[PDB]
Write a protein that binds this ligand. Structure first.
Ligand SMILES: CCCCCCCCCCCCCCCCCCCC(=O)O[C@H](COC(=O)CCCCCCCCCCCCCC)COP(=O)(O)OCCN
Ligand SMILES: CCCCCCCCCCCCCCCCCCCC(=O)O[C@H](COC(=O)CCCCCCCCCCCCCC)COP(=O)(O)OCCN
Ligand SMILES: [Cl-]
Ligand SMILES: [Fe+3]
Ligand SMILES: [Fe+3]
Lengths: 312, 311
């Protein structure tokens, strides 16, 4: 409660012996031992430097229990910019080898669901009534770096409803499996099209551990309205990206730091929606093309494996 | 698969800007911002230096989900030596100012339960039958640094059964509330005594997150047989300590790094348990005295507040 000087122990042989024992550095997976030794040592050193008290350490330890009970570790990874950091490093790798000329990547987020039924060329993906969102058409072409259309590319799409909730993750009810999620296989013309409704921005669960820490930091936990994409096709690297809805006031204040200048396409007002199966004549239209990068020596060294949900 | 040079982006302006934004370090709690800025920046820098891949990062992220789901964050804190590290730092504090003369501290561990009924001088704490454990008597005096008995000290004791399980945390069933957990208030002579059963060493839940990571590090998750104590007294600092059962082959291979050479008292065989209320005539006996350290200006600046179970 009263300030005192930190007593420094990190460089002592006892602490260094403890770090080597606990990480088992130098059976066991050597790479995991190496990573643990470095992260544990950095934590010990930070506790020494900032005089992080046992009360503070146990608050952090018990915070991790709540974070996992909430299922929110990946949400915090986005909120603390760790997920953006991974893109920064992948972007720097692409810049060094000259693979940075396609549509830019941005974060995947934690809300992808595998298994959407694949449609030929066009998918209508709003399965459930949403009185609060107007119809939205997203369309474009999948091309390579040379401008030619990519046949048989798989474009997957997911976004939120007018309350900012995703199917499979709705805390107010159970949406239909794959509501506002689709997948289209492009034809020879490389064209894809999604017919859906306009999303609104996401907000962290207000009593969740992510928002609790953000609240303590003085930060909001909101995202601007956006739509996610995967684009997969042989001969190209797997594209993970997004675009933001034009004009959202949170576009340059995303709590997950995912907005990119090239990922803010214009939205157009259009008519004749009924002829497209849309629920209203006037609709908003976004033209967005995906420019892919090629595999190098047949390899995609930036595809990411992580725990992902799946549905019927 | 093939080796390449790790990209270095940490010292770029974009990363430094991202770190300041994410920690908000520069509304909010300044101390939390400071700690987050440091811990998050260290993590980014570690990712650069070791070229930690996204696949690796996400495995750690999803591991954290499992760790919290299992409710094991504090178990891993002990298993990775973090809990011992906190004691190393408190011990160095005491040494610097000359408060290091008493019974040594060691780790609390995550299995304390508040509320044991305070008995006078002696508590019998084995409520549940355990055919795998013989009787154990633990007895001693609570004194200050000057050797005078401390009257009214509260000595709390908790430990495992012969399967290595604690009441309130037993995976094979439900023990009685406060089984193998006791509280004793010393009288004028400073003496305490617990009548209990002999513990067996603890092992991490085999399918839990802590053992999963220890397995990946090539480490076991076992503790020697031991007994925990709190000693709370109005004029002294609160002592958190333990002792290990003499002769346990894991005394010098504790996965939580909590063994101290001053905390391994002799065990002697005795007879006469019936008159003590023990379930058998023959029993094992441990004399263990607590030497407390005084408060400074009536304050205890080493007492630890953390989430604790109660019953
Ligand atoms: C560094 C190399 C890599 C190793 C680490 C890898 C992970 C680093 C990731 C980037 C940094 C993220 C840090 C996350 C932990 C922050 C915990 C704050 C949560 C919190 O609200 O604690 C409050 C107390 O704060 C306080 O007392 C002050 C802040 C608390 C200390 C936070 C750090 C503790 C370090 C030990 C935990 C292990 C690391 C954590 C990831 C609440 O307190 P309350 O009890 O009133 O609760 C009331 C609510 N229910
Ligand atoms: C509780 C108090 C004490 C806290 C300790 C904090 C100090 C840091 C020191 C320890 C922290 C380590 C945390 C876990 C890292 C390793 C977890 C991996 C365990 C594991 O089984 O993953 C394997 C791969 O490991 C790997 O690939 C290596 C993964 C290493 C990741 C390191 C970076 C993670 C950063 C996360 C911090 C996030 C902060 C904000 C959320 C297998 O993987 P699998 O997928 O095949 O599993 C399917 C089953 N075999
Ligand atoms: Cl129990
Ligand atoms: Fe999203
Ligand atoms: Fe224990």
């Amino acid at each position: 409660h009263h300030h005192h000087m930190s007593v420094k122990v990190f460089d002592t042989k006892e602490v260094q012996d403890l770090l080597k024992a606990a990480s088992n550095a130098g059976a066991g997976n050597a790479r995991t031992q190496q990573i643990v030794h470095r992260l544990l040592g950095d934590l010990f050193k930070a506790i020494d430097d900032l005089d992080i008290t046992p009360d503070e350490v146990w608050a952090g330890v018990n915070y991790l229990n709540k974070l996992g009970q909430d299922g929110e570790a990946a949400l915090l990874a986005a909120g603390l910019g760790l997920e953006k950091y991974l893109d920064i490093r992948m972007d720097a790798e692409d810049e060094a080898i000259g693979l940075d000329g396609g549509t830019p990547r941005t974060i995947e987020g934690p809300l992808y669901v595998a298994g959407a039924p694949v449609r030929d060329g066009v998918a209508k993906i709003d399965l459930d009534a949403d009185e609060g969102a107007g119809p939205l058409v997203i369309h474009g072409t999948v091309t390579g770096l040379d401008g030619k259309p990519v046949a048989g590319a798989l474009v997957e799409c997911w976004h939120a409803n007018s309350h900012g909730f995703y199917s499979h993750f709705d805390p107010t009810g159970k949406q239909s499996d794959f509501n506002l999620r689709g997948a289209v296989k492009t034809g020879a013309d490389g064209k894809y099209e999604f017919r859906t409704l306009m999303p609104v921005g996401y907000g962290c669960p207000p009593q969740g551990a992510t928002q609790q820490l953000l609240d303590r930091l003085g930060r909001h936990g909101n995202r601007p309205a956006h739509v996610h994409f995967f684009v997969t096709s042989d001969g190209h690297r797997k594209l993970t990206t997004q675009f933001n809805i034009e004009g959202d006031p949170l576009i340059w204040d995303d709590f997950a730091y995912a907005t990119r200048e090239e990922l803010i396409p214009p939205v157009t007002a259009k008519a004749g929606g009924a002829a497209l199966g849309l629920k209203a004549d006037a609709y908003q239209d976004i033209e967005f093309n995906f420019v892919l990068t090629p595999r190098v020596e047949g390899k995609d060294n930036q595809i990411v494996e992580r725990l992902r949900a799946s549905a019927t």
